[PDB]
Design an enzyme around this catalytic site. Structure first.
Site, short mmCIF file in Angstrom:
data_model
loop_
_atom_site.label_atom_id
_atom_site.label_comp_id
_atom_site.label_asym_id
_atom_site.label_seq_id
_atom_site.Cartn_x
_atom_site.Cartn_y
_atom_site.Cartn_z
N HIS B 5 -1.17 71.00 -37.72
CA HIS B 5 -2.07 70.82 -36.47
C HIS B 5 -0.64 71.29 -35.54
O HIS B 5 -1.83 72.35 -34.32
CB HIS B 5 -1.43 69.60 -36.17
CG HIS B 5 -2.35 69.25 -37.76
ND1 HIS B 5 -1.97 68.85 -38.77
CD2 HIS B 5 -4.35 69.56 -37.91
CE1 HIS B 5 -3.06 68.55 -39.64
NE2 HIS B 5 -4.28 68.37 -39.24
N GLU B 77 3.52 64.57 -36.79
CA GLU B 77 4.61 65.85 -36.83
C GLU B 77 5.50 65.71 -35.36
O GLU B 77 6.75 66.79 -36.14
CB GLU B 77 3.53 66.53 -36.69
CG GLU B 77 2.17 67.30 -37.18
CD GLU B 77 1.35 67.88 -37.61
OE1 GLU B 77 1.47 69.33 -36.50
OE2 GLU B 77 0.51 67.93 -38.50
N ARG B 165 -19.28 47.00 -25.48
CA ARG B 165 -20.30 47.40 -24.59
C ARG B 165 -21.57 47.52 -25.30
O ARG B 165 -21.51 47.55 -26.35
CB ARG B 165 -19.23 48.80 -24.40
CG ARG B 165 -18.75 48.65 -23.41
CD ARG B 165 -18.03 50.59 -23.46
NE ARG B 165 -16.83 50.59 -22.94
CZ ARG B 165 -16.15 51.20 -21.38
NH1 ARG B 165 -17.37 50.88 -20.45
NH2 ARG B 165 -15.44 50.92 -20.94
N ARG B 220 -14.53 47.02 -14.94
CA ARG B 220 -15.33 46.43 -15.88
C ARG B 220 -15.83 44.79 -14.98
O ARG B 220 -16.79 44.64 -15.08
CB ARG B 220 -16.01 46.37 -16.95
CG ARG B 220 -15.40 45.76 -17.66
CD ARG B 220 -16.25 45.23 -18.99
NE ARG B 220 -15.54 46.43 -20.33
CZ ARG B 220 -15.89 46.35 -20.88
NH1 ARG B 220 -17.48 46.29 -21.60
NH2 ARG B 220 -15.13 46.96 -22.55
#
Lengths: 221, 250, 221, 250, 221, 250
Positions: B5, B77, B165, B220
């Site tokens: 990757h 990795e 939410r 929030r």
């Protein structure tokens, strides 16, 4: 100015599209869009690359989900807020069943929920089952091109037992189906899953799977 | 090339053992720019890697992408490449009334509301940060006079239901998470994010050091909306802090 | 007449103390109190023996927790009702890591929650993490006396896997940290954990650990 | 000496196979006083042991201390010393409106709201009392005309949140236990205590007999407060009952 | 016209009966009823066959539960709606303990909850314990006929570990006790369980067990 | 004779590999009557088996009785006899306002609210129906112009608390199931039944095909009560559909 937090899209961008094909990566998105008419790249933010196209004159969306259930949950939720009600996922995977040959097509009826994100939508006891219509469209599309198709259960986890699932008839492994299927089946959204077997020719397999998911979308419009 | 990757070889790191790991690959260049001799190593998907120099030593800056699964790939990795110290940096929202935009959060441990962390250790195991990393981050934040909050973070596999939410397509939350935010709030949890559970758990259970710092760009629980400028300033401060902490960890 | 159900203490007895050192047994309580000024035994009921002392002119409390998370939960709750907001636990344990020598000091950053009582305060997913300030004070105090210190995770259960925890870097085992840390971290209270390694000199190790927890309290006042 | 914590040798028990196990070591002497030739054996921490004679046979009285972990230590060490019959005795509060102060409760089984019991058997296994012990306790209570209640007890690892008490520092209860008392009440649970789960489970799963009796000294569901004298009288009655039951179990 | 959904019975049919003996099958129901006076078959729908009889002049009900906790839960609930408050189950099973001989009688004090239906009545932590009075009646009844009796725990699952339960003193296995005991113990109903050991003479064992459960009912009226 | 409970030999099936499995043995004869040469094979307890002929091929009709445990016995024994395709048919109530009496439901998968299914596969495994069986059932329903609903079914181990019914002796539901019906409803679950979890799970995990169809004879969410005739008509339609689907699966 976007109507969603991550996709960077607005309601108007979908031009009324109610169906989205959701592969894992941007490169596959382009390949899928290219098979349709009027392909146009709408946006690209982090793991979410979205294109728009037309199938039989109807607008269809193609958007990458990213890796795993967490990234997928974001893409599916926001696309749904934008009006999408049908999601078709396509990918390439390996097979854990001896009778499954490379080049075959796998259509998932339901997934083993070995992930974490699906639990944020429904308790484990709830089936990560695919929509009957979507599953039917994928099977007919695969048959329309003479592809050898296997229909059954897929194992879905957060990692990139073994003989257990193989003994229980599990066809393959992947990381997004559990979240996608559970999410949609428990929220009134239709979802289907198809994958080309690349290991147990690779580019051809991806192409055939891309064609199948697009032809299935056409039967779903 | 040694890793799939990331598309990197061990030689590419030039012996680097410390990596700053932001979530967005578009922020890698900026972080690396703060240091000396910044050079791009690779870029595949949401995995962008840059190498730089801090006080004569090679340092890595690599993006993780969104979610625990993506993060585990990046972390493992990098570990295979020799990275033994991971510094998570980013921006986040807060769920405590007293925490304001511009403030910085240093996470001591995370509530494991994910799945990927379970592959490295049972739920009983704490997603705790390394003491030296946490110390470095706290002292670095203080060196620039930043208002710092040090505590627990809730690491969720979803951005919506797991963070309770309701402004969503379904407008509903599964039983398990109904009223969960109020619960975390009463317990002193500072904020929500989606990658720490995996990063902290796998590092703490494999002899690797990891820490995490984040700038508050929104809250929030407050009626007042964040400033467009104050937010950008917060991102810069967070990057400055993670780099300064890295210097102390070399 | 007591303000609490078990400790047999009143608000006035703490004389404004907001910090308590909580060892497991009464004998250790006396040892800890003796290192400070104006040591006085306040009460003793069942597992709960409490002394009061002064550090740099400030009142500090020393109270035994008893065995396990259940007894500890009682002592911490009632001490908190009395005004305590900072808890420092000190003990002696064995080590499960080869690199840890007898006489070394272990400072716990967080604990593996293998107990039952911590669940009465927060779901398993919540970290049994120690307060950063308390952990810092313990580390600096240990360093101030030249003690070889190890900082990391401790396994905490209700019994007085094995290679698993050792492979995951667990330093030692004990029975109260999970409850103490979880209790405080989820209720806005500050808590720290330090232990002298007596097995993998014993009295010396306990003494050095007792000194460290008292010097850490001083840095926390 | 043969056992660490208890500080006893097998010879000390003089062949005793039955032990009355109160929670508080300060109650051991009183219980032992009811019998013949009472003698103190040891006293370490909250582990006080006395030996006595009942109808010519040696009997043990040993305290367990508070909580399942402490109890398991006492029970296992006594078992190592040859004890095969355990009679738990103490005082408790009730959570049923019809159960009044002065009444006696005999526990047939306990709800396992603890952790220590899980070390001896899976949660699926019942923390059930031995039939002969339970019978002896019930008949003994009746022999003195005591108002007896025989049923389930809830055994909790905490005195506060697990017993859904809100009169605490935080004034909050974790989700899992919110509304739990009302649930136990509707299910017929008589009271809360903190040691039975461990005692009953480990005994029932290891071929050992165990029972438990307790006098009601308070009822949080009643407005009327308990009498100072009626409470002391209840303690004496409970001790009388456990000893009388012991006689029938020799 | 029935007051219940499955049993096909009315309140009046029980003629005031407050106690029911609940075996698993219709054939056993007849055998049990035949031992009492005025035996009369009331109804039979699916797994639920109900008879009525009189013991010492008092009406008693005998009703089959069917197989497993699910079927049993239906029979117990509806019988309770009809006025039954005491349930005595009788059956035949095998023994997993060497000291238990064929022909012996097993009286269950509590059951290992390895089923699914008991969870619909109480969380796993709640004991599937039998009523003290019912257990006493069964033990005395067995003794009244000189039957060798074993009193203890029974394992109850949904299937028709092994050395584990045997090591923990489990006497036998079956499929209905967990649901029955939990159901009644958590809803204020009295329940008892007795079984004749037929394997580790068969008809004699069933007869002796049938006699015992009927004599226990008599002591419970 | 080859199987205990069913009391059948393999020769009795005459090579049949497909079985229609209703719950009530009293409905077996009717289902078998729709086909050619109907003959009774056996009848023990609630296990009634009849054999018939469909388009020249032998077909089996066998009752399962009530509940997962009873169903598992029937299914496994039939499997031992060579049955590889199972078609569940029956009548049910609905929990969705839009689903009316007379409608037919085809189950794609079931919520596993049982215990028996756990013996064949972990809860993570989906109690999913076979695609060919489901297709056959859907097309058969359409061939007769029936209003069909295709979706999830909730398979419960109890008829009362697991289906959140309060019209009971206790009038209470355990915490775990309180508000569960509203949850399933919001998730699109069509109805409740008690055998599918076991049937679908054991078949899907053992290379066997299984499907399920059911006629709606009542809807607890509607005020209007069902017609006495419309209900009987629904039963006949459901039987017609399962047989027609069987023809397509031979």
């Amino acid at each position: 100015k976007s109507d969603v937090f991550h996709l960077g899209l607005t309601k108007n961008d979908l031009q009324g599209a109610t169906l989205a094909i959701v592969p894992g990566d941007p490169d596959r998105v382009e390949k899928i869009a290219a098979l349709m008419d009027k392909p146009v790249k709408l946006a690209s933010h982090r793991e979410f690359t979205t294109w728009r196209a037309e199938l039989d004159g109807k607008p269809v969306i193609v958007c990458s989900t990213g890796i795993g259930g967490p990234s997928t949950s974001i893409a599916v939720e926001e696309l749904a807020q934008l009006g999408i009600r049908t999601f078709l996922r396509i990918g390439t995977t390996g097979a854990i069943q001896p009778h499954i040959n490379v080049g075959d097509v796998l259509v998932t009826t339901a997934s083993v929920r070995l992930d974490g994100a699906s639990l944020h939508f429904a308790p484990l006891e709830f089936p990560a089952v695919a929509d009957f219509e979507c599953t039917t469209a994928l099977v007919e599309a695969a048959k329309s091109i003479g592809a050898t198709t296997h229909v059954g259960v897929t194992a879905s986890s957060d990692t990139f037992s073994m003989e257990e699932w193989q003994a229980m008839g599990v066809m393959n492994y992947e990381m997004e189906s559990a979240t996608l299927l559970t999410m949609c089946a428990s929220q009134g959204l239709r979802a289907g899953m198809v994958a080309g077997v690349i290991v147990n020719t690779m580019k051809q397999t991806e192409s055939h799977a891309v064609k199948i998911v697009v032809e299935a979308a056409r039967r779903l419009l």
